[PDB]
A paper describes a structure:
As one of the most abundant cellular proteins, human p97, also known as VCP (valosin-containing protein), has been assigned an ever-expanding role in a variety of cellular pathways. VCP/p97 is a homo-hexamer with each subunit consisting of one N-terminal domain (N-domain) and two tandem AAA+ ATPase domains (D1- and D2-domain)234. Connecting these domains are two linkers: the N-D1 linker between the N- and D1-domain, and the D1-D2 linker between the D1- and D2-domain. The functional role that this 22-residue D1-D2 linker plays in regulating the ATPase activity of the D1-domain and how it affects the function of p97 are the aims of the current study.
Numbering used by the authors:
A (entry chain A): 15 to 460
B (entry chain A): 118 to 460
C (entry chain A): 235 to 351
């Protein structure tokens, strides 16, 4: 016989980061106790496809015993999604590195000039003693953007701690973003704030269909196949759908309501059917219908017969969805009353979620998300900003953050042009957005 | 096993299904019988291909059960796996009994009507809110009477270029005639034949008109009942009610407590339910719900129970198995969880 | 960071909204493409839509650029006050092009109307 324990205590379900760092994972204290790990220890993590990662373990007082909190960078390095399982073990083997090689990922540094490496890598590693593994991809934020690098070599191999004495080499051909599994510019749950309950509902709703599709050939129960998201404009309904696709590894097909209706008749209908065929061929898949009320308004508010045909074509496709595995259709609108109530029938849009307006705490979270690539001066009080933006939605606060960044840049473009200066990674990264900049954006009317 | 009924199941079907079906039940069986076993959130069918003594016996503790051979094809065999019947319908005994009696002679004794000059009803309209089982009823009646079933979906018709919509209606009526005795069910009739107050434009008028013409031609095609479904009388064109079109109406209302219980039992018959599951409680608290609500509820509790167990499953590197599915109990907590959501 | 890409100017007729847009183009060295609302709507359908798309392609090729839409309410009225399906198609075509603007650098669309409503 060839034995090996099953039900191992070091297998854990992956859960979201609360502490946002590429180098840290969180367990519960009772798990750490059970596993003989201590605060600040180096841990070796094993995921899918034989991938491994090295990280610093900490205690978190809200982590469930069977779970591990890890951020999106680490998940991609491990090839896991939220809900998958990894194993964890001590790595006391890890030495201070002599030298490492890193390369940038090409698209992530397009349009940046100057010493990227100095500007990004130094503040990322400086006195942080980050453990890293050969093959890791990591994300660095600053200068109003995010940049990605691959660890292509390490000495000692294949892991080390990046310590003050560690030399960092960056010469080589830049890495292509297509050859590599990372999340630069891909929306995730960490990009969404202020709507935890509803996101948790959507999560649980799509868990089995998207993550365990083969289940449904084994059982005769029907999963929900259509989810409707309600709420005012700017409330992140498109962001939510995209996040869920990305976070579950599902294919995403966006249908824009206006775009459909901008076509000659027959074309509109052919384009809908094509969308549904494509999601089926790439399933597991989410079809998101943006501005659904452009396409499927009520009969009271219909005008003419191409418009009736097109609502009809949509309802027919929704009815054909039970025959195409494993496709969830998500769709967005301002409120129930807009749309054709035939869309609510059993086996079409049989689930609804109300994405309301964030509260103070949600706004704060939204502002933190939309400033994570910025340098903010010490006087920036995002809690104040959050307290005074009553009734604002996510799009308002993103606009606000863009407007303060841009005001701060206009201030500094004059000084820049006075000295014949060109815009530089160094310039962008040292440029602080101040409270005055946010006060200025808060005081406009548009 | 019958092939389609075990597609997507893995593991020892035979152990998982056949043992609890026969265990200490002393079921008498005949060679050639097909039988249905429920569990693991599905139903499975088997044929009895041989018996010893032949051609019948009691399946007793000592009886050995052989399952090696080529699986039986579902097309070569007359059974009801996944076919809706009256046993799939609850909470509306009176109205189902009316529909039954209405279609009895035309569908079951069609040759009668060449002998007599009396006119049977040819059009029945089912009213009631959405989710109330009107499609299920029509299908059940077709299956239970051996009639051909042709579904016309209202939206699907209207999704076509004009002329196509009308050609598709006429094609439906020609097909039911060629395979009669037959039921034509029109789902969401008000998509196709609304009132003149609420009509918009002239392809829409043409299409109601085409429908009324076909209904009038129905007395000339033996022996076709047209059933059709809508939210209420006021929706649809009142010309549909004329003698010799939809001359019979049935109100499929909302089930009461006892009907809901029955609905819940139907929609849990493939599930293992823990002892703490009190379907009477569930039925008592779902006032105003309809059949689609309670089926959704049962699906939602099954799925919550599976999510609970998928974590434990993934923690031990486990694959999903007939054994796993059949031992998996849905609990009251699972139903309480589904009852506490809003959607 | 995302710059604003669409600015709407409100005010009664004769208040210099066209003049403002032109002034800004000239004073910034940007390319100017005027879309006249009535002119668009005076065309056979498909032509109206082709002409809008052509306008947006041209501003992109000569960017930095301002697209000014004069009398926008001729083209994109509310659904309450819409009549028929070429008119719906044309508002729809405009919204699609506006959504495609983030993909074409560095085009500001300015547009003029009597009031928000
Ligand atoms: N809950 C949120 N958290 C973070 N950002 C948000 C949120 N809601 C909206 N936003 C921001 O505002 C933008 C508005 O985007 P969108 O998802 O298109 O809104 P909707 O689909 O509801 O109109 C998003 O792209 C995102 O930048
Ligand atoms: N009386 C009932 N008994 C059992 N199940 C029902 C009943 N009514 C509805 N259902 C369930 O809910 C679903 C709703 O189906 P459907 O027949 O399409 O409703 P309707 O035609 O009235 O919209 C059915 O497929 C069945 O699963
Ligand atoms: N603020 C202003 N200053 C100077 N001239 C103006 C002003 N507003 C309007 N005009 C004059 O009146 C004319 C009206 O032009 P126009 O810009 O077409 O108005 P609008 O676009 O608001 O209808 C301008 O061409 C200019 O001659």
């Amino acid at each position: 016989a060839i034995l090996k324990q099953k039900n191992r205590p070091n297998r854990l379900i992956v859960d979201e980061a609360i502490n946002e760092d590429n180098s840290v994972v969180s367990l519960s204290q009772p798990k750490m106790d059970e596993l003989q790990l201590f605060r600040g220890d180096t841990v070796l993590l094993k995921g899918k496809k034989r991938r491994e990662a090295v990280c610093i373990v900490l205690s978190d007082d809200t982590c469930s015993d069977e779970k591990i909190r890890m951020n999106r960078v680490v998940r991609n390095n491990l090839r896991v999604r939220l809900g998958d399982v990894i194993s964890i073990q001590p790595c006391p083997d890890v030495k201070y590195g002599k030298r490492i090689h890193v390369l940038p990922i090409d698209d992530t540094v397009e349009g940046i000039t100057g010493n990227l490496f100095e500007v990004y890598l130094k503040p990322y590693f400086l006195e942080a003693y980050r453990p890293i593994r050969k093959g890791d991809i990591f994300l660095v934020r600053g200068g109003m953007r995010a940049v990605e690098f691959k660890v292509v070599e390490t000495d000692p191999s294949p892991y080390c701690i990046v310590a003050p004495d560690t030399v960092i080499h960056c010469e080589g051909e830049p890495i292509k973003r297509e050859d590599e599994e990372e999340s630069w510019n891909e929306v995730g749950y960490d990009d969404i704030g202020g709507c935890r309950k509803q996101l948790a509902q959507i999560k649980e709703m799509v868990e089995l269909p998207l993550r365990h599709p083969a289940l449904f050939k084994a059982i005769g129960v029907k999963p929900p196949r259509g989810i409707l998201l309600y709420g005012p404009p700017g409330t992140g309904k498109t962001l939510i759908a995209r996040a869920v696709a990305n976070e579950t590894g599902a294919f995403f097909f966006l249908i824009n309501g206006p775009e459909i209706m901008s076509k000659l008749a027959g074309e509109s209908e052919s384009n809908l059917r094509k969308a549904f065929e494509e999601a089926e061929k790439n399933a597991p898949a989410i079809i998101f219908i943006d501005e659904l009320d452009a396409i499927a308004p009520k009969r009271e508010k219909t005008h003419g017969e191409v418009e009736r045909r097109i609502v009809s074509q949509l309802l027919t496709l929704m009815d054909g969805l039970k025959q195409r595995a494993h496709v969830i259709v998500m769709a967005a609108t301002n409120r129930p009353n807009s749309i054709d109530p035939a869309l609510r029938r059993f086996g079409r849009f049989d689930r609804e979620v109300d994405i309301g307006i964030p509260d103070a705490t949600g706004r704060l979270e939204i502002l933190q998300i939309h400033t994570k690539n910025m340098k903010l001066a010490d006087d920036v009080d995002l809690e104040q900003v959050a307290n005074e933006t009553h009734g604002h939605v996510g799009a308002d606060l993103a606009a606000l953050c863009s407007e303060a960044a841009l005001q701060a840049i206009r201030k500094k473009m004059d000084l820049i042009d006075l000295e014949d200066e060109t815009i530089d990674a160094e310039v962008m990264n040292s440029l602080a957005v101040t409270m005055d900049d946010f006060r200025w954006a808060l005081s406009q009317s548009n």
